[PDB]
Amino acid sequence: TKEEAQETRAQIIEAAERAFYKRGVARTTLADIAELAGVTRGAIYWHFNNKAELVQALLDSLHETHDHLARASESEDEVDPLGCMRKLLLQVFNELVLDARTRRINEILHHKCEFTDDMCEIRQQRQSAVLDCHKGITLALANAVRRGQLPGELDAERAAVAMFAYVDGLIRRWLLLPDSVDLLGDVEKWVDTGLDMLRLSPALRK
Amino acid sequence: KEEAQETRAQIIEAAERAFYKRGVARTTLADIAELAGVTRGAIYWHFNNKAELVQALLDSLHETHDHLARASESEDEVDPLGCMRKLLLQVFNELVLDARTRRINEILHHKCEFTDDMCEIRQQRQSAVLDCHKGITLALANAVRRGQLPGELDAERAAVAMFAYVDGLIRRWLLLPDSVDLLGDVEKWVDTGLDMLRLSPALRK
Numbered sequence: 001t002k003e004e005a006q007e008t009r010a011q012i013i014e015a016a017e018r019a020f021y022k023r024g025v026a027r028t029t030l031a032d033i034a035e036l037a038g039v040t041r042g043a044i045y046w047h048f049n050n051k052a053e054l055v056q057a058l059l060d061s062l063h064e065t066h067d068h069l070a071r072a073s074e075s076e077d078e079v080d081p082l083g084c085m086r087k088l089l090l091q092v093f094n095e096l097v098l099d100a101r102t103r104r105i106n107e108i109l110h111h112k113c114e115f116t117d118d119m120c121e122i123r124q125q126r127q128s129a130v131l132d133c134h135k136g137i138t139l140a141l142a143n144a145v146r147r148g149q150l151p152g153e154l155d156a157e158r159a160a161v162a163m164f165a166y167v168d169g170l171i172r173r174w175l176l177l178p179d180s181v182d183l184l185g186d187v188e189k190w191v192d193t194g195l196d197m198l199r200l201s202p203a204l205r206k
Numbered sequence: 207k208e209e210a211q212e213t214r215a216q217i218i219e220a221a222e223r224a225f226y227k228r229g230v231a232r233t234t235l236a237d238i239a240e241l242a243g244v245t246r247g248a249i250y251w252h253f254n255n256k257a258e259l260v261q262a263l264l265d266s267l268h269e270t271h272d273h274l275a276r277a278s279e280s281e282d283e284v285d286p287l288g289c290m291r292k293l294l295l296q297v298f299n300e301l302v303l304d305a306r307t308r309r310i311n312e313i314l315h316h317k318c319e320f321t322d323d324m325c326e327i328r329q330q331r332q333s334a335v336l337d338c339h340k341g342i343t344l345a346l347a348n349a350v351r352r353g354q355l356p357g358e359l360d361a362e363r364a365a366v367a368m369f370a371y372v373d374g375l376i377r378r379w380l381l382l383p384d385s386v387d388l389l390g391d392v393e394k395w396v397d398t399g400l401d402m403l404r405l406s407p408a409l410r411k
């Protein structure tokens with residue numbers, strides 16, 4: 001409930017993003033995240049025990065902007081879940097293009113963050129999160145089955161992986177070669193292309 | 207050879223070992239050299255720097271599929287889409303059965319940072335992806351020229367959609383393998399992809 005410590009936590013997060021982004025997550029110490037932030041070594045430790053905790057705080061911020069539509073899509077009480085899933089994807093893509101903060105954490109996540117046995121928790125955290133995310137899209141896809149928006153004999157599980165794979169590879173393609181996906185201009189196409197596969201692909205049924 | 211040609215294959219092997227253990231960012235050539243039992247100078251005779259080693263591991267992934275790739279990319283092929291099916295199935299098989307291929311993909315996706323202290327890695331990957339992208343395009347185009355796919359079909363985007371999907375499937379399997387019976391369901395996983403390209407209006411113009 002104090003405020004200096006809420007200010008200081010929010011500045012460690014900013015510095016970390018800028019640091020991890022220049023030097024990468026591998027060779028960046030917490031001492032480093034200190035000098036850049038203006039703060040003190042001790043303060044980073046009060047706030048974060050280790051760098052894997054910090055990285056986790058970063059990955060976690062990405063789910064905040066989307067919580068609403070995510071929760072709506074998966075509630076069995078939603079009238080239009082495919083509807084919420086389509087708007088979620090439009091928002092994910094839009095936020096990625098407009099918001100430099102999101103583009104950078106994604107860049108840290110995809111191109112600047114090694115899984116080395118020396119730092120085992122980076123990978124575990126990441127596994128957990130993809131399983132989480134996985135959980136969600138499944139409940140959601142199965143809801144669009146009941147309500148007759150997706151084919152009735154769909155395999156939610158596999159369909160979820162298909163879609164996740166598709167969204168993940170596309171975000172990554174765009175971070176590597178933005179000038180090859182007019183992702184802002186065509187966002188509707190890219191999102192719908194993914195959904196297409198889910199509703200029509202015969203190999204996703206059963 | 208005189209001074210070994212093989213020394214090369216031995217440096218590449220120690221590079222995979224070091225890279226897989228400590229990652230690309232913090233492996234030095236002295237690490238690689240001690241791992242291979244040679245000196246830094248022996249490394250310098252085959253490679254100018256670390257980005258050259260990474261490059262050579264990356265470029266080693268392409269050999270196996272070589273002929274099925276050219277086959278798809280050739281106009282004179284009777285069955286371009288079937289050649290892409292054969293290729294995807296091999297990509298998935300080799301990845302699941304060959305520890306060497308699994309380890310290098312794992313280096314590439316999860317143990318290789320792009321940082322401006324070396325920008326060559328990011329650049330090498332970029333051209334690598336455009337190269338491959340260009341191949342998919344010409345592949346998708348033939349399948350259209352012979353009515354294996356829908357008509358006048360927007361290739362460029364279906365290409366990107368293809369690569370995105372395969373790429374993210376691989377990465378998904380490297381992260382959580384016991385959640386994609388990749389080996390066992392290879393047929394379904396490949397075709398889900400191919401179904402996208404033929405049955406998706408959004409990929410039509």
Ligand SMILES: CN(C)[C@@H]1C(O)=C(C(N)=O)C(=O)[C@@]2(O)C(O)=C3C(=O)c4c(O)cccc4[C@@](C)(O)[C@H]3C[C@@H]12
Nearest residue numbers: 267268271293297301311338342368369372373376
């Ligand atoms: C080791 N792994 C198996 C291969 C690889 O080294 C890749 C890489 N970027 O290093 C892939 O992206 C690789 O995983 C990959 O994504 C490949 C493809 O996407 C395709 C697609 O989609 C269609 C036709 C041909 C290919 C391909 C030959 O380029 C595939 C090569 C794949």
